[PDB]
Amino acid sequence: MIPTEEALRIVFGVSKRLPPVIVSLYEALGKVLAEDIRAPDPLPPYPASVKDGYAVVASDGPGEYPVITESRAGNDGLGVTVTPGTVAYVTTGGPIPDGADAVVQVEDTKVIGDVSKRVKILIQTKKGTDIRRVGCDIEKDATVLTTGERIGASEIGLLATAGVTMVKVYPMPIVAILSTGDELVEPTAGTLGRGQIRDSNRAMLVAAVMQQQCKVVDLGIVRDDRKELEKVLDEAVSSGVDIILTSGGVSMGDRDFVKPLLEEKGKVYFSKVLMKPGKPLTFAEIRAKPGKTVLAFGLPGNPVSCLVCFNIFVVPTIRQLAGWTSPHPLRVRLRLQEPIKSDPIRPEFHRAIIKWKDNDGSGTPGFVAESTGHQMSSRLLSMRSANALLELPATGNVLSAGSSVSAIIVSDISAFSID
Amino acid sequence: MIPTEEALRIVFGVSKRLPPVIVSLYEALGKVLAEDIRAPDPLPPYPASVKDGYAVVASDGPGEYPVITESRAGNDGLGVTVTPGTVAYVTTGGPIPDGADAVVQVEDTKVIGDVSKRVKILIQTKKGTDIRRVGCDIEKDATVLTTGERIGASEIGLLATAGVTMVKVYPMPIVAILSTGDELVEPTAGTLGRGQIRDSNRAMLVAAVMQQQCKVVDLGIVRDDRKELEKVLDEAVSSGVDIILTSGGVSMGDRDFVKPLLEEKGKVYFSKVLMKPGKPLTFAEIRAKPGKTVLAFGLPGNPVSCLVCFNIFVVPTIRQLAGWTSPHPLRVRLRLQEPIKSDPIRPEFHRAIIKWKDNDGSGTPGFVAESTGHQMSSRLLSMRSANALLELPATGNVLSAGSSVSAIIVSDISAFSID
Ligand SMILES: Nc1ncnc2c1ncn2[C@@H]1O[C@H](COP(=O)(O)O)[C@@H](O)[C@H]1O
Ligand SMILES: Nc1ncnc2c1ncn2[C@@H]1O[C@H](COP(=O)(O)O)[C@@H](O)[C@H]1O
Ligand SMILES: [Mg+2]
Ligand SMILES: [Mg+2]
């Protein structure tokens, strides 16, 4: 039985970034860049107006002037030179005609006469005012995005700015998922027969893997039969998946074949972890016959233990395979809203609902946590709405309301409900 | 020009939750429940063993006993009564045979003899030990999920537990997106002609809407021509989309037709907001001809202003339409890692890279922020890697390193890179 910190280091040490691939612009969203991106031309590529108004010769100053051209886009004002004593109309983003050295926003001007166009400039401007010089936002050949950078909406915007529609990225791993048990029935079952339960771990894990943006290979329910589970595992290993997730069949039962099958097919690094919940977790590395490595997680059958182990061990493995340089989950410090008793032997991953408060109880703003209630590993209602796992050390003491603890954030911090 | 707080209240007051729909189990992931979910049967539906070991009569105590049945699943041990002086083998999740009232884990037992099976129970157990009574995890008819609850992986697990494979939920809005400008070219363009730039806002907004899990209707580049933009807007309004996003054509240019077109087609609630960046934001409500409401956001053309306005105003509108009871973004308090000058007139949404530190500079743990650098609204590099918007009040003063500010979190808090 190894500590969770060691089990994580073993998984990190075995897990390898996947080979990069080439994808289209919208397929690159959410993925990590596997190349640097350089601007092929400057932004703006021409001197551009910051305002709707008039391009002027700054030294002219306030006065009345004829409007010799209008410049909004493309070839507008091409070949026209704004000389001292003239002005040109411009819209925001319009090219500055040759000879103009500043822009006076339309609010500081007045159109004069009926009908030839004339405008009154109401202020003294300064050279360079309200003009974006060539390359002031992005210089030609500047690196706008680098290898190891995760692509979000602004990074998609920068790729589009630089004219990149095919991107080299690290792909997401493909994950096979199966459930084990003679007691299981499909979640479509109505009236349950004696000694049956609906398979809940498979759909829970499919959903968890969908939230990590990975393709899922759903291998269904497997019975407690060694030859049957070996056949499904051999089929999962040779299919091309990168990760295999099983649940159940990893305790002390006489028909728990997951561990001995992973020992035959590959190398089991560990089968027991000092943690509450999640003790019987198995981690193995299998080589598929030519050829590639396949990571196998023998997750515990208990629904809570299953999802806690997914959140702590499988999420960083997916991220590592997908080329994330920082795969660890966000850990914050927070105050307890109620007392919680820690375990005397195993450090606990106590499920909680956390929120940011203007006053965390200590007079300063901070995160606070409420327990989800009874933490029994068979009680999936303890995972309901839990956005964090409180890391309670193995002291056996009652942590009173107001005490501070470390918490792992397991669900979108930007989707956190406010206080 | 209205404050951002008022502009948000107007948007919230106009935005209505979409009618609920019925979807399959995996389609419900990420969506808000539009009905309560009750367990049709208990969990466990039979008294179940917590351990691999033996089901016993607690009062018998330590001793040697014959193993009269084996119970792992289904009908195993049906009709067999464990009487005083006998035991039954059980696996975790196996039904407890009639007459047995406790379970002794296999580690507290020893198999005796060769070959009839006999086992030695090494301890004195207590009635009810290591047995999950019927309904101890979930009672029959208990509400396991309620209306207004967002569905994550554990909620998918609870739906599967309760045998629900078709779910009533609030759908996501469908969003139409177009760009405006005679200066724009597609992001596939190579060498740019004079006065041209690649359309970056459209792909940026498509990506931003994809991260919000909404269907996108890509309406392309529209030129600065009133009749052309009216035709595309009329086509967007009658297509069935719930939200229309335009960018550009909302400043003071003589060919900026977005505002007057939204005034003709519907009701414009505002066209100017007191903020840095994002001043020319237009918000309108259009009624499609029978019939339904369509929300239109005339986003600013400047790439930074475009994305900042999306993050502040469009994200909560999407969430409100999708039935989120808490659509507001997460706001935290944090310390500045460097000095920042605030604007004397407009409150600024200064882009930053934030992280949780064990020491935020004050001796206690907390979030800290680094600026992304020059904040010019034309500089999309200021959005690069920004996971927060610092809310800087309009004081004109230099906020020194170490001072505390409010920050809006704009990207997955569970995807935050650690310190
Ligand atoms: N797919 C599943 N869905 C729900 N419960 C499960 C699943 N697989 C295993 N379990 C339960 O988890 C516990 C441990 O499983 P095992 O390790 O196979 O003994 C038992 O109570 C099982 O009935
Ligand atoms: N789709 C777009 N992509 C990049 N820049 C844009 C886009 N639309 C408008 N702009 C720029 O944003 C600024 C304001 O646009 P407008 O409001 O149309 O004058 C100008 O500098 C435009 O060239
Ligand atoms: Mg089992
Ligand atoms: Mg324009």
Side-chain angles (χ1 to χ4, degrees), chain A residues 208-271 273-275 277:
Chain A
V209 172
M210 286 170 74
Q211 295 188 116
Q212 297 301 318
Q213 314 209 67
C214 297
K215 174 174 178 68
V216 172
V217 176
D218 186 335
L219 296 180
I221 294 171
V222 181
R223 302 305 176 182
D224 304 319
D225 178 281
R226 201 183 200 280
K227 288 284 183 187
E228 187 181 324
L229 185 58
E230 172 171 48
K231 179 178 182 296
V232 175
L233 288 171
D234 288 346
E235 288 162 351
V237 166
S238 62
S239 67
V241 301
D242 302 292
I243 301 171
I244 296 166
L245 303 182
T246 71
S247 77
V250 278
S251 312
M252 303 299 292
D254 67 340
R255 297 193 185 175
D256 284 352
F257 300 117
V258 170
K259 283 160 187 181
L261 287 170
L262 296 176
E263 296 178 333
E264 248 174 58
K265 271 95 238 306
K267 179 163 182 189
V268 168
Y269 292 84
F270 58 89
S271 46
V273 177
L274 186 68
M275 66 185 297

Side-chain angles (χ1 to χ4, degrees), chain A residues 130-271 273-275 277-288 290-340 342-410:
Chain A
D130 282 324
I131 294 177
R132 281 160 63 221
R133 65 165 170 79
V134 169
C136 71
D137 296 298
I138 307 174
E139 296 285 346
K140 175 174 168 160
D141 306 320
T143 298
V144 296
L145 302 166
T146 53
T147 311
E149 197 164 352
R150 198 179 171 216
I151 300 164
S154 78
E155 294 74 28
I156 289 295
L158 288 159
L159 286 157
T161 300
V164 180
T165 47
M166 299 300 301
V167 198
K168 195 174 176 171
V169 301
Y170 296 109
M172 305 310 296
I174 303 168
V175 186
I177 307 176
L178 63 87
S179 285
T180 72
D182 293 353
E183 80 284 16
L184 303 181
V185 295
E186 294 293 331
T188 52
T191 304
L192 300 171
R194 182 187 183 278
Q196 295 180 332
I197 61 168
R198 293 187 192 83
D199 174 8
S200 66
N201 287 354
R202 190 153 46 90
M204 181 180 74
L205 287 170
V206 163
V209 172
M210 286 170 74
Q211 295 188 116
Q212 297 301 318
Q213 314 209 67
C214 297
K215 174 174 178 68
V216 172
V217 176
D218 186 335
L219 296 180
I221 294 171
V222 181
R223 302 305 176 182
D224 304 319
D225 178 281
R226 201 183 200 280
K227 288 284 183 187
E228 187 181 324
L229 185 58
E230 172 171 48
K231 179 178 182 296
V232 175
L233 288 171
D234 288 346
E235 288 162 351
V237 166
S238 62
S239 67
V241 301
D242 302 292
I243 301 171
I244 296 166
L245 303 182
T246 71
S247 77
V250 278
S251 312
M252 303 299 292
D254 67 340
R255 297 193 185 175
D256 284 352
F257 300 117
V258 170
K259 283 160 187 181
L261 287 170
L262 296 176
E263 296 178 333
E264 248 174 58
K265 271 95 238 306
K267 179 163 182 189
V268 168
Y269 292 84
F270 58 89
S271 46
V273 177
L274 186 68
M275 66 185 297
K279 179 238 230 201
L281 180 64
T282 299
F283 176 67
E285 182 192 30
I286 296 156
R287 153 128 277 133
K292 75 160 174 194
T293 298
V294 182
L295 302 183
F297 288 94
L299 301 167
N302 281 307
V304 171
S305 305
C306 183
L307 190 50
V308 165
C309 287
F310 178 87
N311 290 347
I312 295 167
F313 301 95
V314 182
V315 169
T317 303
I318 285 162
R319 289 173 172 190
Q320 173 121 305
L321 265 54
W324 287 46
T325 57
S326 202
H328 294 63
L330 176 61
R331 263 174 180 76
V332 301
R333 199 85 193 176
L334 61 75
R335 298 197 172 280
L336 302 179
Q337 291 268 71
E338 59 189 292
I340 295 168
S342 71
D343 194 89
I345 299 151
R346 296 175 296 156
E348 191 181 55
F349 291 88
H350 191 112
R351 279 71 68 202
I353 296 162
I354 83 168
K355 67 183 168 173
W356 183 271
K357 287 191 80 194
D358 297 314
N359 191 338
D360 69 358
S362 83
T364 41
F367 288 110
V368 297
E370 252 185 71
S371 165
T372 57
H374 292 120
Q375 300 292 293
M376 194 164 174
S377 69
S378 56
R379 185 190 178 253
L380 186 58
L381 283 169
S382 69
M383 301 306 304
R384 187 188 165 187
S385 335
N387 54 7
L389 296 167
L390 309 177
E391 310 185 274
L392 313 186
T395 67
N397 300 331
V398 177
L399 308 180
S400 66
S403 59
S404 88
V405 301
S406 181
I408 301 157
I409 290 176
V410 297

